[PDB]
């Protein structure tokens, strides 16, 4: 058996909502120390890696490693089915046909039990070795979201250019071009608006706007996004959870 109870059901929905577009069939691998999940999109330029630690649940038991594969389209149909104040519990047996999602209300009343049929999927789980990166930044998800959404309208490519004390996003297309230059700053009134930057080397990478438009959906999990870039290597966009993360590794458009 697996019994994993989230304190708030909403958390699981937000988690799934950051992946849900950009990859539809995914294997969730549960074990003693939490659940991890990975998926690559059809074009093989974007890998999504999820890690929910034990500390993110209010109760967690996993006696034996268990892989449960699910269609996220199906799963998000069932995750408009509890209040943001119910508890959600995942229940699975040994070698399962199915996952159970049990939503329970605080006042001992209203159980909603869903049984979702599982899928068979090919589990290329990758031990991803932490790279060192030429630059690291963090900024608000909303700000990053707006930048990407705005520039996407001008082109299929967005270029991210980091220099000392300067982050520059640029897009260039048929109607015109656009560039958004933001600078590091810490505002102590609300430090969730802060923009932070750690640069060893300048970087200049270009990415598909299609992929950035799916990555920015991690904003459902976190106020902030961490971006790690280097010139050798795929970029990391990371959205942090209470004891976990959702990461997106994106391949640059080499030109």
């Amino acid at each position: 058996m697996l019994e994993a109870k989230f304190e708030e059901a909403s958390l699981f929905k937000r988690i799934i909502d950051g992946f849900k577009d950009c990859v539809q069939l995914v294997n969730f691998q549960c074990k003693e120390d939490g659940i991890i999940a990975q998926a690559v999109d059809d074009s093989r330029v974007l890998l999504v890696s999820l890690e929910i630690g034990v500390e993110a649940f209010q109760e967690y038991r996993c006696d034996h490693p268990v892989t449960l594969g699910m269609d996220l389209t199906s799963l998000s149909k069932i995750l408009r089915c509890g209040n943001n104040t119910d508890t959600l519990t995942l229940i699975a047996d040994n070698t399962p046909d199915s996952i159970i999602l049990l939503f329970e209300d605080t006042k001992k009343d209203r159980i909603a039990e869903y049984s979702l049929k599982l899928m068979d999927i090919d589990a290329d789980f990758l031990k991803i070795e932490e790279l060192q990166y030429d630059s690291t930044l963090s900024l608000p998800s909303s700000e990053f979201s707006k930048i990407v959404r705005d520039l996407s309208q001008l082109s299929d490519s967005i270029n991210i250019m980091i220099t000392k004390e300067t982050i520059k996003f640029v897009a260039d297309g048929d109607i015109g071009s656009g560039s958004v230059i933001i600078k590091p700053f810490v505002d102590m009134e609300h430090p969730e608006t802060s923009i932070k930057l750690e640069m060893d080397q300048p970087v200049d990478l270009t990415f598909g706007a299609k992929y950035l438009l799916d990555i920015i959906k991690g904003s459902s999990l976190s106020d902030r996004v961490g971006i790690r870039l280097s010139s050798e290597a795929p970029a990391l966009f990371q959205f942090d959870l209470k004891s976990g993360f959702l990461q997106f590794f994106l391949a640059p458009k080499f030109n």
Binding site: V40, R44, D124, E129, P234
Partner: peptide, 17 residues
């Protein structure tokens, strides 16, 4: 080369123990 290929491009020469 996929994204996985790019991620694994150094740990491919390491033995996974």
């Amino acid at each position: 080369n996929g994204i996985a290929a790019m991620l694994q491009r150094h740990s491919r020469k390491r033995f996974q123990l």
